Design a protein around this nucleic acid. Structure first.
Ligand SMILES: Cc1cn([C@H]2C[C@H](O)[C@@H](COP(=O)(O)OP(=O)(O)OP(=O)(O)O)O2)c(=O)[nH]c1=O
Ligand code: NA
Length: 342
DNA sequence: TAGGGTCCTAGGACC
DNA sequence: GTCCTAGGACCC
């Protein structure tokens, strides 16, 4: 065998950072997200705002109809990154087996740990306490014998808490667990699963793997495994970024190539700057563009290409503009880069 | 009805 | 098989 996996997850991460750096926001409803006038969405919200129904990914117009006094912040990504680096350094104090999934969360493999008398529970507890002491931010944690159960667990005693799932507890936990709580089972999948009478891990246990493989491919094997507590994925501390993208949704749809070209001229220096931080010679594997139309269809056009080049992105966007727009208006323009393999 | 990404699928090209 | 490209589901 049994591993001890901890998933650490910061509470209301972006919003928690803003309230720490401005205590005036502590008890009023706030949210990081673009304005209604920019057609933006909520990145996240504090608990005063969540009380009204405000959620990550909600259109900002909907947020404000639910919570008219919502205070809207633009977001300070360097401040989030600074806090992320700090908590990761704190993780390193306890193990090198750290797989971060995002700025604010990480899997830890504490199986071969010596710290708190081998206790994963006490280790998770003083990570959360150390985070609070050194950053004035709170985290929740989940402790389980595999990654996905640890992740489900870190959500269950949020904010500022934790939850532990022992292998003895695993079967009762699974029996009623809704499928939609498994990472990677989203709305489309959960609706497909519901349309055949499958709601929970107990429901999936009672059905045949061969059928699940037909109907969901490799995904159906994942569902079958997870519904049994089976998650052999190792905590991997060696993953690297593979792409970088820069895209923008305009406050109004554009209808003229000249407007599209202007957008790209402003997007391109931001893409070069971010690429250079990680590859100073701008050498890349592919580059490409993205248009999202008014019928919310999205198209991408990307090709092998050795080195970030503005004119070829303009050229490609022009081809895409002409060949695939079919007269509809355009809400989004994006530039994209696929990085070399090593 | 964002912007930052990952992983998977699938057809044709190419070997 | 494996590369190329396009698109979709999903996560934070
Ligand atoms: C889900 C989500 C998160 N984010 C950002 C803001 C979040 O603070 C950060 C981490 O996401 P989460 O861990 O999903 O959410 P959270 O920290 O805000 O809330 P919770 O306490 O329930 O865990 O990433 C988005 O920008 N868009 C999204 O759709
Ligand atoms: Na979080």
């Amino acid at each position: 065998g049994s591993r001890k996996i901890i998933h650490v997850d910061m509470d209301c991460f972006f919003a928690a950072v803003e309230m720490r750096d401005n205590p005036a926001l502590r008890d009023i409803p706030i949210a990081i997200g673009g304005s209604r006038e920019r057609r933006g969405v909520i990145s996240t919200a504090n608990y005063p705002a969540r009380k009204f129904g405000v959620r990550s990914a909600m259109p900002t117009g909907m947020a404000l109809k639910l919570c008219p006094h919502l205070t809207l912040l633009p977001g300070r990504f360097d401040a989030y990154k600074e806090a992320s680096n700090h908590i990761r350094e704190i993780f390193s104090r306890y193990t090198s087996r750290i797989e971060p999934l995002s700025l604010d969360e990480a899997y830890l493999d504490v199986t071969d740990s010596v710290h708190c008398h081998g206790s994963a529970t006490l280790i998770a507890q003083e990570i959360r306490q150390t985070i609070f002491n050194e950053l004035q931010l709170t985290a929740s944690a989940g402790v389980a014998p595999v990654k996905f159960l640890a992740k489900i667990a870190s959500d269950m005693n949020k904010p500022n808490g934790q939850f532990v799932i022992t292998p003895a507890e695993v079967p009762a936990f699974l029996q009623t667990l809704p499928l939609a709580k498994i990472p990677g089972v989203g709305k489309v999948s959960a609706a497909k699963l519901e349309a055949m009478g499958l709601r929970t891990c107990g429901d999936v246990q009672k059905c045949d793997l061969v059928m699940l493989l037909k109907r969901f491919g490799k995904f159906g094997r994942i569902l079958w495994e997870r519904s049994q507590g089976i998650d052999e994925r190792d905590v991997n501390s060696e993953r690297l970024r593979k792409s970088v993208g820069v895209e923008r949704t305009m406050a109004e749809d554009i209808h003229h190539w000249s407007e599209c070209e202007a957008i790209i001229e402003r997007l391109y220096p931001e893409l070069e700057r971010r690429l250079a931080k990680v590859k100073p010679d701008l050498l890349i594997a592919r580059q490409g563009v993205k248009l999202k139309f008014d019928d919310f269809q999205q198209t991408t056009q990307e090709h092998v290409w050795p080195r970030l080049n503005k004119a070829d992105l303009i050229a490609t966007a022009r081809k895409t503009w002409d060949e695939r727009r079919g007269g509809r208006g355009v809400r989004l323009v994006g530039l994209h880069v696929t990085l070399l393999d090593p």
